[PDB]
Design a protein around this ligand. Sequence first.
Ligand SMILES: O=P(O)(O)OCCNS(=O)(=O)c1ccc(OC(F)(F)F)cc1
Ligand SMILES: O=P(O)(O)OCCNS(=O)(=O)c1ccc(OC(F)(F)F)cc1
Ligand SMILES: *Cc1c(COP(=O)(O)O)cnc(C)c1O
Ligand SMILES: *Cc1c(COP(=O)(O)O)cnc(C)c1O
Ligand SMILES: [Cl-]
Ligand SMILES: [Cl-]
Ligand SMILES: [Cs+]
Ligand SMILES: [Cs+]
Ligand SMILES: [Cs+]
Ligand SMILES: [Cs+]
Ligand SMILES: [Cs+]
Ligand SMILES: [Cs+]
Ligand SMILES: [Cs+]
Ligand SMILES: [Cs+]
Lengths: 395, 395, 268, 268
Amino acid sequence: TTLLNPYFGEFGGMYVPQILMPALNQLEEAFVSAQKDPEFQAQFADLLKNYAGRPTALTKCQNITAGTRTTLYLKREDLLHGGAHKTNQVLGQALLAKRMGKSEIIAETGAGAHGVASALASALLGLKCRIYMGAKDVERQSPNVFRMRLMGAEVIPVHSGSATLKDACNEALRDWSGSYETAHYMLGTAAGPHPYPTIVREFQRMIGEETKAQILDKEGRLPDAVIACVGGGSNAIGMFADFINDTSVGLIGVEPGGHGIETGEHGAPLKHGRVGIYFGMKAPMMQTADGQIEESYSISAGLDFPSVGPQHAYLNSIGRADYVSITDDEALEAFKTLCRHEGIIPALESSHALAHALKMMREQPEKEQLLVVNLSGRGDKDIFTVHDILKARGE
Amino acid sequence: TTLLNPYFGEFGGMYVPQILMPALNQLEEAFVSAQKDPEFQAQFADLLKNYAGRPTALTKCQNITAGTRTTLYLKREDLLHGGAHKTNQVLGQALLAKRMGKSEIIAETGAGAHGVASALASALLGLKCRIYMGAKDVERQSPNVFRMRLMGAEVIPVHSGSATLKDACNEALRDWSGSYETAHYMLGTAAGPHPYPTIVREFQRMIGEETKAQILDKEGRLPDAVIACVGGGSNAIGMFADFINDTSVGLIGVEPGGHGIETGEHGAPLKHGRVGIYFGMKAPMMQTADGQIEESYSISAGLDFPSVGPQHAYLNSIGRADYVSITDDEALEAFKTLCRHEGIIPALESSHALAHALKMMREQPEKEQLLVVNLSGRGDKDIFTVHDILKARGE
Amino acid sequence: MERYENLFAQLNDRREGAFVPFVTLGDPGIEQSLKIIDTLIDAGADALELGVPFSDPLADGPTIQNANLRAFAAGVTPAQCFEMLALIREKHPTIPIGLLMYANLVFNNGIDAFYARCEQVGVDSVLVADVPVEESAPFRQAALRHNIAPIFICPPNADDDLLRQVASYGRGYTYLLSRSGVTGAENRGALPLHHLIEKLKEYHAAPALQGFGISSPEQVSAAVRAGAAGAISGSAIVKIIEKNLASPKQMLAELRSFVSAMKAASRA
Amino acid sequence: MERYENLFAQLNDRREGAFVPFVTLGDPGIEQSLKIIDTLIDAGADALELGVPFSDPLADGPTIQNANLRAFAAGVTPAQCFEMLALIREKHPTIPIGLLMYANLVFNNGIDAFYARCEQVGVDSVLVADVPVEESAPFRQAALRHNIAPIFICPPNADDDLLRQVASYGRGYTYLLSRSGVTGAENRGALPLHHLIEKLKEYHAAPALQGFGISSPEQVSAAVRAGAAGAISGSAIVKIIEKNLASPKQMLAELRSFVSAMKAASRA
Ligand SMILES: O=P(O)(O)OCCNS(=O)(=O)c1ccc(OC(F)(F)F)cc1
Ligand SMILES: O=P(O)(O)OCCNS(=O)(=O)c1ccc(OC(F)(F)F)cc1
Ligand SMILES: *Cc1c(COP(=O)(O)O)cnc(C)c1O
Ligand SMILES: *Cc1c(COP(=O)(O)O)cnc(C)c1O
Ligand SMILES: [Cl-]
Ligand SMILES: [Cl-]
Ligand SMILES: [Cs+]
Ligand SMILES: [Cs+]
Ligand SMILES: [Cs+]
Ligand SMILES: [Cs+]
Ligand SMILES: [Cs+]
Ligand SMILES: [Cs+]
Ligand SMILES: [Cs+]
Ligand SMILES: [Cs+]
């Protein structure tokens, strides 16, 4: 039995080996307790404000919308300590590990953003941190690997399966299957087995809460739509949550279209995959015809999770949220546009959200619309990728 | 004649060719006017808050001071948009250029931080930006050069003199000598000819103002000392200004000791150079015995300005502020310490300030002292430098 | 499931435990895997546990992770595994054949259709490693509709409620986990299981087979002495495959020697 | 300063403008620089402007930036330049010798001592390029104490106050800037200067020499026609050095030809 519903409609659940069920039940209890504990909430708020820098700015971008009827704000998760929204929820989960009496952290990472986020939270809070990373990601993300090691974390390359993110996800679960009495598994997105999709949403929901307050203050009304990129779903559900009951507010999630949906080289399972069961949940996923799990392709390494959180699949099924895709080339035009016209270098992940807002504007430039893009991170990490594309293209 | 005193005691002045005097007089008038203009102050405050992210956090660092009587806070200029405090004053100067009816910006840069800051402010405010950079700095700072170009700025390599920062400083002045009717020279530190040391201080003083408010709120008293690294002097004077009249508050500036003061390979002119006249000011500088200007050496490329702002030289001479140095190795131990024990990767510039606070603590661990370090920027940019040292050292 | 009922009744008459090896289907290729499996049977295996290669075997340690990888290197698909299973049953009338599955391979083309195919090829049980009792309903229901035993895991710290659920829902055998963690011969269980064994019998559970870390004759005899109906060994068997890839004949010789020794340990 | 007073009186008697070349001392080496300077004089230079190599010549365009760099490549120091200056004066009794300095080289070992050394070697004027009138007091005072003319810059947009200051404080000649920007033959001044020339005379200023971008005979004649006492040419001269580094004899030939042509333009 559980305290909370492990499903969002038919999506979600707890598809872990039996041995891990007491670990999920323990975590769910500790979370429900923490959410009622004003000492826990105060400690979390203190870390978010004085260590991470919350609240984050809401920036009105005038140059990029000039001569249209679109008003565009960017919620600046790029300004959070660590340079991405991931920092919010790792601080909450590290506090949950402490609450349960654990002093060790296990984390998975693909391109390394969540590994770095886990390592910083662990360094701050005095927790011993070990991070699993597919050997192919290790080889291509030396900067993030070195950041994790500077912060005192152990980075363990994973050589099994495809040696990428899904294989690190398995390895973290394997370890936790034996170590959960002393270690907490700090899952990096709003996916996996219950209670993680719920915990990660609640520890990211300050994004949407602040956005609502900031847009009431600046515009005197709610946005027409809030727009976020979707890897596993954490930044998007963090932006969406506080607006779900505001039925006039559009919720738009943007999956990576990669080389184009029709090529099969993409990362858009919610709209172009097939429901399956993997990583502890029933959810849309990238898989072969006979049920083997596949990689998510995108120009943006941070959009590599090969499935999507179950709350997104549910919000889609009921028509509360709408999901779209943006290709590598659209993302890369949005990246260049924000740099040149606003002086902000966006993460290539976030550039997918911005590319979709730019399309909403350009397609219907006389439509009055008040839009917020969740700028989930900064793009310093991406300037080599972008340089190399532009060079190979002859720009 | 001028509206404000161009000197701080015997330091400072306006040592520019006659042709540039009307440009300095114009800028001084526009600044004095802007400081009385509540529309200008409101526009500046709006950019600082909603675009740059002010106020910045003040973080209490508990792990690094455990078991001593030091309480250490870090003022988090690393969280500002752009990743360093430079963003504050470039936004103010870009508003001054607009106030004067100029739509073009000229800037100098060494390691590229000020070039990137100038380029982002210019992109935001629709100004055409050209940036001079010594050819040797261009070659070694490809990431920052590409950032400036993504933001629509022109980067012009300078091949004259030593092909480094001082030579870019000359080139910017050469250009301005002909273009000042349409272009503003956005000088990158609290140095050069009046009115720049005054303007840059006033457009950085929110650092110390916020720090004072934040420390009154958290501790109910003023700090025992505020500590900042000193390249040209902007982050340090920004932290110091609001505390100058609080005579119980120590003001400690940290120059780069490089390989050691005794080696001559350093960047500490305030304490180990010789007063001269260069870059429009009378100030301590790195120079040969017969008066040729020399380079400032530090492990940190951002501490390469070969002189120091005149207000620092003055505050030193009257004993209001104290200046010390920190070597490459001390800076690099402070960098590793903050990463491992607080999960914050500091700029190697800022690491010099932190290294000095760590020394204040370690030398006298039973001394009760409340210290603030100005964490002038983040250190993502430095992880290759640090990696390479640690490898060559065999760590 | 009836094949397990008959096997355990016959073993009880022979005062004997069951010895049950695990291998990955198609490791290191289809033809060699078929010969491996016939060798395990000829050498004394009482039942088989057979894994379908899956991209994400999250209850398995490195030995079996690598077996999955070898089968994939040989192009082994679930369809080819079902062809293998039909052939194995066509050769061997009474040996219970259990599959070790991961949920996505069962759900992929419909849970009911999966169990219908198992019944068609003559499989006797299915253990879905990432489906805990809480999520088991559509799996156990489909299993029973198609005369397949759903195999439930009893962890070494199972409380009374869990014991009662596993006892009620399971058929064929109860999987008695030696320890926490994942499969592997490098980690032996150190917890006494005889209390769990006794409670499972009290609740009329399917007979218990101890599994995880069983690599030696003395562990087989210990499982029987503790009151279990037998023991499962995976990694130790797969190790022999991995060691002997270059020599298929030596591989079969060593598999025969190992299985013979392990089976001998169950009699006494 | 008296050498300028005598020169301008003699030129006024000859109905002639002054032609004044600039070169960097020690470019491209000490010995060649000495020969260059003697050639400029023999070819008709009325006075000289001589630069001491400085690391940061911020009023100079690329041509003279590169002259500084050549002198540094030859190891030229300010001490060697003062040795050169003493030798130049020992050869030539009456030609006015003006230095083009940057402030740090003047301040370095004491402003008074700098001007005392100038007087010892027989220099007649000093122009400090990065000291505007507002900062000029200790420089002009030291100059006058040591019988050195302090040279002030009159920009092409000088207002009445600036004209009055430059007129009062200056001696020797008034430097009449052709245009904004920095030294260089690639940019010719396009602003009429005759109003400034007239006001400087009204205020009893030192006679005006037009400088910046003067590269052709017609500009020398234009300066004289506008009422200036003569013209200074730097970059055009230094260009000839730069072009002919590989052939010191052709360099001197071309310098002689150029200076002769430029001087001829001042007579008429
Ligand atoms: O001898 P070892 O240690 O390799 O163990 C062999 C086990 N192979 S198996 O098919 O029984 C088997 C049984 C259960 C498993 O996981 C679960 F418990 F979560 F369901 C995994 C494999
Ligand atoms: O012919 P060009 O264009 O090279 O000009 C030659 C000038 N050489 S100089 O010594 O008179 C000279 C005079 C003044 C200078 O700068 C100042 F105006 F700021 F003071 C620089 C050089
Ligand atoms: C990790 C990451 C994402 C995608 O993960 P979500 O869980 O979908 O938010 C998006 N943007 C940035 C900057 C990231 O670091
Ligand atoms: C530029 C820079 C400095 C040094 O410049 P100051 O003008 O002395 O502040 C210090 N820290 C950081 C992070 C910088 O970017
Ligand atoms: Cl509210
Ligand atoms: Cl106040
Ligand atoms: Cs359900
Ligand atoms: Cs608009
Ligand atoms: Cs995805
Ligand atoms: Cs003074
Ligand atoms: Cs302390
Ligand atoms: Cs310095
Ligand atoms: Cs049963
Ligand atoms: Cs005079």
